[PDB]
């Protein structure tokens, strides 16, 4: 199922396959844009690590790292991929299922409705 | 050569913290930071350069 | 200095990598494209 | 050759025609502040020391004790 | 238990069944039996019934409840409580 | 039915009735499009999202074009890239230049469909030049540079149909068309702060954010808001050390696609008033300590006070993960407490609903119930303070449907016509004994929502008394396949505290300890804790529960750490960690650990994989993140927790009164935000920029 | 043309494992037989017994790995190495690279331990 | 002047650089570090340093505050900060400024403040 160490050939460090977790998702639509074009690619990036994650330099104030790993992101066509190669690699997952909008029906002439009754509130246009 | 910031003839910097020079920095030389000013302008609180990455591109 | 030589350490980075891929645009940028199969290399269609 | 006005240092270099006290007053630039020229100080006390222009991101808490 | 008793059932197996009998029938008897102890049910759909039972500081035991009937269930609490 | 039509040669099956661009975006086309949303009204101003359809003569809007059988739309043609450049040209005519200084540059729709759908260059360069417009004050969370709007009616729509705030509206005429309040008032509303995102320029931006960072240059970090107990998903931005903004991200069953506004702009808390170094107090004042001096200290004072029993209390506050609670608990119970108490008043008492069956303390109905409801009766509860989002989505459904709600409990204001019954149980008790009573056994699906608040009075038997009688008696409320009866919690920890048993014995509640042990703990006076006592507090900001201690440890915020929380919903959820802790903070039931070790009573794990595992024995349904299934126990949990034991309470006559006093401080970040502090004084209801007469 | 250098092998996946292993063990005498040349070549502190120690431990890091076209990349590793190590086109800097253990104490704390990995922030 | 580190001992500094600027006192942005903090922070490196040396510009944010308001007759002030004596596009982008509002609105880019006369 999954590559123990010390049989795989990339020759990583040890660490990244005994104590790192990385999460496979999908980018969410961001709420600032109506574009999706990000979301149809499966990341794989790593959750950090709290003490080597970011630090300030006591001279220029600036963000010291000691996790090499802070800017890796790889991109897959398909879960099953992505999930293929961390296993093929010995790397700890999780999985985040991708959330989507469920689908209405929308008609413009349902503004204009007629109420029978005491108007809910006055739509303005 | 060497980088400068400019002001305004009254003075008044120019940078307002855009930081499109941030983004096309193809060494990574350029730190910016940015707030509102007292005065509500938008401007940087903090802006370097490390000369020491720079390619003077 | 106390080895007298040069030793390999893990890395540790005084400013950290800043990937501004994170700003990569959210519109697809080009569409399509066009074929410029010849006439002679597409299929033929009944009729 | 830090020593040499900027101004001076372009004509030298054949950057212009015209020298500085030559130049018109239209092509000056307009200060608000008084002007002052510093030459290359390394190597000495004067040489320029970095620092962080800003305050830590994370203030901490104000230790401030209650009586039950 | 003394302390604390956990059930752990599914809600749509089939080797849950038992266990959802004896809770649903005999829960209140238990509660009763026991006036101190804090008893918790908590279902999922991939989990084996199993009980969990917390005595003092802190020691805990459990048994597997794949069971026939809401009696075998019974007696595999009470051999736990014990 | 479903009817079938083809867009660019595909072949796209959709619902009769919806519009062209739903229909578009099922089959994979991209429309353009500003003031078109999926939540929001159709409008159909922008123009931008024309195409073409062979029947019709000129080019159609696509949002607000029904579709119809055998329809043929192409959305490549010649006419429809001239038709989209025509648009742009005309949108980008008085848009300022305001790109380098605007806060949506770099995520700008403007932007991006201008450069994919737009002409390269302009035409416009007339010395008259563009037009202006005023800016206008609503507040002091959204920004305005009202040059920058592209009169989309997005606030406008949002503003008045979802959130019921009918202060904003567009005012004038043609070209001096403007949005605002036509005098000055403020956006006041708690959800105002999701106009910023619904905004596709940079008009409307969030203030305390404003000018600190760009798009490009954000991590973004997947997580869940522990402000409320609905458990919204969020987006956390962050760079460096430090966090930027809270966006919302889509998840249909919890927030739709929106957060109030104490979520979004309670971030500025995080980085003021934290605690960053272990604290011991010395006579009257703190001091800086090392983390083995801390401890070290808090063993001597284990020793010396020598608890026995249920003499070593733990309190949890609202704010705390799964995880930290089960170290705290089982770290307690080994040391042979029985003495877990969670915040509330009264928490020093088990619930009245109890804790045997999940059912008894959750929102059963699933928060996608409230979707379907015909009628809804609150008790002792203002969903519009305690869960915001819930409260958007009940006014959603009484917008859409019929549907009858009325609410026992104080006079609230509310986005939705409520029928009030009475402030007390004897006017509970007329109502589910009078008409309303029957408008729930008629009603298909109702539901009963009761207010965490109820749970913590001390006649709160009484009301669930009552109110299991009614279920038990109803099939409607109470059948095999709706379950109407629904405790909406306030703190996002409540559920999870109630799902491992955090929850005191009863001898335990008589004792007076000699050690507290505050995980949060907020909320807690001066009373609660004995003047012997040594106390331990362990949290992120100072506040209250930080003054009363002896010993401080400081302890990683929600977004420093991959917890575990479990909202009202009972949906266990997962968090992830956008930055690390600052300072000498730790994560939390590591520090639980590491004090139990100095304590002799060292917990069996230390290891994340182990805490989930443990969490695993704990409950099943911690370690399954994302799901919630019913329980088959309903009929059975009423009797047995809700009727059965509080038949003895006795009901005061004390009226319901409101949960939580203000809305925008209720935890230790927002009481240490700035901006929550700024947004309380600016949005109180004596205020006449709040007002509207 | 441009012909091999010394101690070169062409490259060639084996097909059968016990070829393999013949190829391993052949290998690994050639390590064995090299120890005093590396010995000289890098001005190592250490003894020569050190040098066969870190290479028996090297070897043994692999003795379970089972498919077979893993040992085959192993295997054009471990030789890859050997060559660059005999032939001295390695330094003194990247061999002792090989040879983390017999540098002195780095402190007076590595932390064992929850409650000293904890004091760190290490836990 | 005197300022207490953090080992207890005391610094001292000059009157004179201790002012944010030298035409300004104290801080104009909030995250802004105050001089006398840079020094309690970076002391060491300023040991045996000439801070008359240092660069010092001076503070923008008075400078255009003692530039005069620009009066303007209609609803709209046009500002694009260009030089009128060089060649090219030296300015910031053109920009309308409203000032149908009661006082001052400042130019986005410049800080030039116009009013409606
Ligand atoms: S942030 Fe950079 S690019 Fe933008 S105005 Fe300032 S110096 Fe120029
Ligand atoms: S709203 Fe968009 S297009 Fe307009 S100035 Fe801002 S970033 Fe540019
Ligand atoms: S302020 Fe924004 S959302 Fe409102 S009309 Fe203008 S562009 Fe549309
Ligand atoms: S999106 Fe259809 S006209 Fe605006
Ligand atoms: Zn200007």
Same mark, same amino acid.
């Given at each position: 199922d999954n590559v123990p160490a010390h049989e795989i050939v990339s020759g990583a460090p040890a660490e990244l396959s005994?104590?790192?977790?990385?999460?496979?998702?999908?980018?969410?639509?961001?709420?600032?844009?109506?574009?999706?074009?990000?979301?149809?690619?499966?990341?794989?990036?790593?959750?950090?690590?709290?003490?080597?994650?970011?630090?300030?330099?006591?001279?220029?104030?600036?963000?010291?790292?000691?996790?090499?790993?802070?800017?890796?992101?790889?991109?897959?066509?398909?879960?099953?991929?992505?999930?293929?190669?961390?296993?093929?690699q010995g790397w700890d997952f999780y999985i985040q299922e991708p959330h989507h909008r469920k689908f209405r029906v929308k008609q413009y002439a349902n503004n204009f409705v007629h109420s029978y009754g005491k108007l809910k509130h006055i739509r303005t246009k | 050569g060497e980088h400068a910031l400019r002001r305004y003839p009254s003075g008044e910097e120019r940078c307002i913290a855009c930081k499109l020079c941030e983004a096309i920095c193809p060494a990574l030389?350029?730190?910016?930071?940015?707030?509102?000013?007292?005065?509500?302008?938008?401007?940087?609180?903090?802006?370097?350069?490390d000369m020491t990455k720079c390619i003077y591109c | 200095e106390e080895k007298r030589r040069v030793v390999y350490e893990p890395l540790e980075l005084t400013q950290a990598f800043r990937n501004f891929s994170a700003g990569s645009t959210a519109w697809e940028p080009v569409g399509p494209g066009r074929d410029d199969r010849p006439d002679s290399f597409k299929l033929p269609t009944p009729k | 050759m830090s020593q040499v006005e900027p101004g001076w240092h372009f004509w030298?270099?054949?950057?212009?025609?015209?020298?500085?006290?030559?130049?018109?007053?239209?092509?000056?630039?307009?200060?608000?502040?008084?002007?002052?020229?510093?030459?290359?100080?390394?190597?000495?006390?004067?040489?320029?020391?970095?620092?962080?222009?800003?305050?830590?991101?994370?203030?901490?808490?104000?230790?401030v004790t209650k009586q039950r | 238990a003394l302390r604390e008793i956990r059930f752990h059932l599914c809600q749509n197996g089939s080797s849950s069944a038992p266990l959802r009998q004896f809770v649903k029938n005999q829960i209140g008897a238990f509660q009763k039996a026991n006036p101190s102890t804090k008893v918790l049910v908590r279902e999922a759909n991939g989990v084996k019934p199993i009980v969990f039972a917390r005595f003092d500081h802190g020691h805990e035991s459990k048994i597997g409840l794949d069971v026939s009937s809401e009696k075998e269930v019974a007696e595999r609490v009470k051999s736990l409580i014990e | 039915a479903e009817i079938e039509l083809t867009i660019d040669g595909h072949k796209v099956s959709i619902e009769a009735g919806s519009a062209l661009i739903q229909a578009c975006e099922k089959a994979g086309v991209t429309v353009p499009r500003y003031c078109y949303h999926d939540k929001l009204a159709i409008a159909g101003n922008c123009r931008?999202?024309?195409?073409?359809?062979?029947?019709?003569?000129?080019?159609?809007?696509?949002?607000?074009?029904?579709?119809?059988?055998?329809?043929?739309?192409?959305?490549?043609?010649?006419?429809?890239?001239?038709?989209?450049?025509?648009?742009?040209?005309?949108? %980008?005519?008085?848009?300022?230049?305001? #790109?380098?200084?605007?806060?949506?540059?770099?995520? #700008?729709?403007?932007?991006?469909?201008?450069?994919?759908?737009?002409?390269?260059?302009?035409?416009?360069?007339?010395?008259?030049?563009?037009?202006?417009?005023?800016?206008?004050?609503?507040?002091?969370?959204?920004?305005?540079?009202?040059?920058?709007?592209?009169?989309?009616?997005? #606030?406008?729509?949002?503003?008045?149909?979802?959130?019921?705030?009918?202060?904003?509206?567009?005012?004038?005429?043609?070209?001096?068309?403007?949005?605002?309040?036509?005098?000055?008032?403020?956006?006041?509303?708690? &959800?105002?702060?999701?106009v910023i995102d619904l905004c596709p320029?940079?008009?409307?931006?969030?203030?305390?954010?404003?000018?600190?960072?760009?798009?490009?240059? &954000?991590?973004?970090?997947?997580?869940?808001?522990?402000?409320?107990?609905?458990?919204?998903?969020?987006?956390?931005?962050?760079?460096?050390?430090?966090?930027?903004?809270?966006?919302?991200?889509?998840?249909?069953?919890?927030?739709?696609?929106?957060?109030?506004?104490?979520?979004?702009?309670?971030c500025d808390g995080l980085k003021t008033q934290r605690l960053t170094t272990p604290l011991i107090r010395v006579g009257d004042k703190f001091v800086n300590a090392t983390w083995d001096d801390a401890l070290s200290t808090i063993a001597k004072a284990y020793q010396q006070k020598a608890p026995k029993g249920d003499e070593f209390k733990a309190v949890a506050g609202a704010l705390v993960e799964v995880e930290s609670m089960v170290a705290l608990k089982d770290m307690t119970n080994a040391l042979g407490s029985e003495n877990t108490t969670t915040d509330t008043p009264n928490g020093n008492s088990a619930p009245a609903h109890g804790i045997t069956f999940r059912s008894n303390y959750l929102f059963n109905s699933s928060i996608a119930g409230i979707e379907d409801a015909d009628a809804i009766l609150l008790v002792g509860t203002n969903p519009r303070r305690e869960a915001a989002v819930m409260n958007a989505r009940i006014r959603k459904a009484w917008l859409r449907q019929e549907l009858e709600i009325a609410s026992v409990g104080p006079t609230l204001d509310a986005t939705f016509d409520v029928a009030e019954l009475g402030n007390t149980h004897a006017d509970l008790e007329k109502a589910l004994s009078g008409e309303f009573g029957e408008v729930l056994k008629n009603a298909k699906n109702p539901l009963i929502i009761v207010g965490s608040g109820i749970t913590d009075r001390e006649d709160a038997g009484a009301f669930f008394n009552t109110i299991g009688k009614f279920v038990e008696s109803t099939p409607s409320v109470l059948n095999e396949n709706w379950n109407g009866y629904n405790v909406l919690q306030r703190s996002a920890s409540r559920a999870g505290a109630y799902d491992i048993g955090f929850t005191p014995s009863d001898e335990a509640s008589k004792t007076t300890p000699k050690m507290v042990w505050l995980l949060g703990a907020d909320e807690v006076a001066a009373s609660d804790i004995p003047a012997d006592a040594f106390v331990v507090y362990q949290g992120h900001n100072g506040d209250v529960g930080a003054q009363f201690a002896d010993v401080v440890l400081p302890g990683a915020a929600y977004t420093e750490k991959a917890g575990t929380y479990v909202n009202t919903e009972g949906r266990?959820?997962?968090?992830?960690?956008?930055?690390?802790?600052?300072?000498?903070?730790?994560?939390?039931?590591?520090?639980?650990?590491?004090?139990?070790?100095?304590?002799?009573?060292?917990?069996?794990?230390?290891?994340?994989?182990?805490?989930?595992?443990? %969490?695993?024995?704990?409950?099943?349904?911690?370690?399954?993140?994302?799901?919630?299934?019913?329980?088959?126990?309903?009929?059975?949990?009423?009797?047995?927790? &809700?009727?059965?034991?509080?038949?003895?309470?006795?009901?005061?006559?004390?009226?319901?009164?409101?949960?939580?006093?203000?809305?925008?401080?209720?935890?230790?970040?927002?009481?240490?935000?700035?901006?929550?502090?700024?947004?309380?004084?600016?949005?109180?209801?004596?205020?006449?920029?709040?007002?509207?007469? | 043309a441009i012909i091999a250098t010394a101690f070169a092998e062409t490259v060639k996946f084996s097909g059968s494992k016990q070829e393999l292993q013949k190829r391993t063990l052949a290998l690994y005498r050639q390590f064995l037989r090299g120890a005093p040349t590396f010995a000289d070549l890098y001005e190592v502190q250490f003894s020569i017994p050190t040098i066969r120690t870190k290479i028996r431990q090297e070897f043994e890091r692999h003795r379970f790995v089972d498919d077979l076209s893993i040992q085959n990349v192993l295997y054009a590793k471990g030789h890859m190495e050997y060559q660059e190590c005999i032939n001295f086109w390695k330094q003194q800097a990247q061999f002792l690279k090989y040879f983390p253990e017999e540098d002195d104490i780095q402190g007076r704390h590595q932390p064992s331990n929850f409650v000293d990995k904890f004091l760190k922030n290490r836990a | 002047k005197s300022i207490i580190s953090y080992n207890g001992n005391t610094i001292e500094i000059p009157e004179e650089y201790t002012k944010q600027a030298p035409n300004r006192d104290s801080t104009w942005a909030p995250a802004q570090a105050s001089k006398t903090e840079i020094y309690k922070n970076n002391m060491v490196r300023f040991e045996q340093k000439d801070l008359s040396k240092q660069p010092m510009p001076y503070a923008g944010i008075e400078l255009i505050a003692q530039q005069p308001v620009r009066f303007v007759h209609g609803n709209t002030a046009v500002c694009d900060g260009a030089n009128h004596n060089g060649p090219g596009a030296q300015g910031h982008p053109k920009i309308f400024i409203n000032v149908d509002a009661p006082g001052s609105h400042a130019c986005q880019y410049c800080g030039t403040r116009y009013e409606k006369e």
């Open positions: 005994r104590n790192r977790v990385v999460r496979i998702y999908q980018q969410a639509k961001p709420a600032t844009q109506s574009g999706e074009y990000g979301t149809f690619a499966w990341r794989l990036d790593w959750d950090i690590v709290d003490v080597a994650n970011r630090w300030e330099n006591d001279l220029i104030g600036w963000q010291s790292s000691g996790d090499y790993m802070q800017a890796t992101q790889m991109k897959f066509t398909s879960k099953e991929s992505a999930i293929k190669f961390a296993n093929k | 030389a350029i730190t910016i930071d940015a707030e509102e000013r007292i005065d509500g302008s938008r401007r940087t609180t903090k802006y370097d350069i | - | 030298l270099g054949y950057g212009v025609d015209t020298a500085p006290c030559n130049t018109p007053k239209e092509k000056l630039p307009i200060r608000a502040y008084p002007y002052k020229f510093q030459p290359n100080y390394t190597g000495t006390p004067g040489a320029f020391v970095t620092y962080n222009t800003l305050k830590p991101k994370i203030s901490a808490w104000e230790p | - | 931008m999202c024309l195409v073409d359809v062979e029947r019709a003569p000129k080019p159609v809007a696509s949002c607000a074009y029904p579709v119809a059988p055998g329809m043929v739309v192409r959305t490549d043609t010649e006419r429809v890239k001239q038709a989209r450049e025509n648009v742009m040209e005309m949108m %980008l005519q008085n848009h300022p230049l305001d #790109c380098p200084v605007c806060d949506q540059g770099g995520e #700008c729709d403007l932007q991006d469909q201008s450069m994919r759908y737009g002409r390269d260059r302009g035409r416009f360069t007339e010395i008259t030049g563009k037009r202006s417009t005023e800016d206008k004050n609503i507040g002091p969370l959204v920004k305005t540079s009202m040059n920058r709007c592209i009169h989309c009616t997005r #606030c406008v729509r949002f503003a008045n149909d979802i959130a019921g705030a009918p202060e904003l509206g567009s005012s004038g005429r043609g070209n001096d068309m403007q949005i605002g309040t036509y005098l000055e008032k403020n956006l006041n509303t708690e &959800l105002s702060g999701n320029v940079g008009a409307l931006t969030n203030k305390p954010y404003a000018f600190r960072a760009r798009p490009w240059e &954000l991590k973004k970090t997947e997580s869940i808001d522990v402000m409320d107990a609905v458990g919204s998903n969020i987006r956390i931005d962050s760079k460096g050390v430090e966090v930027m903004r809270v966006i919302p991200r889509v998840h249909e069953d919890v927030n739709e696609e929106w957060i109030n506004d104490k979520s979004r702009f309670a266990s959820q997962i968090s992830r960690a956008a930055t690390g802790p600052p300072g000498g903070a730790r994560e939390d039931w590591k520090i639980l650990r590491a004090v139990s070790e100095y304590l002799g009573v060292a917990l069996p794990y230390e290891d994340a994989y182990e805490v989930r595992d443990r %969490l695993a024995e704990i409950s099943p349904s911690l370690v399954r993140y994302d799901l919630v299934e019913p329980t088959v126990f309903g009929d059975v949990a009423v009797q047995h927790s &809700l009727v059965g034991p509080n038949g003895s309470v006795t009901p005061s006559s004390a009226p319901l009164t409101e949960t939580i006093e203000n809305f925008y401080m209720t935890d230790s970040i927002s009481r240490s935000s700035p901006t929550m502090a700024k947004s309380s004084i600016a949005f109180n209801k004596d205020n006449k920029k709040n007002q509207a007469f | - | -």
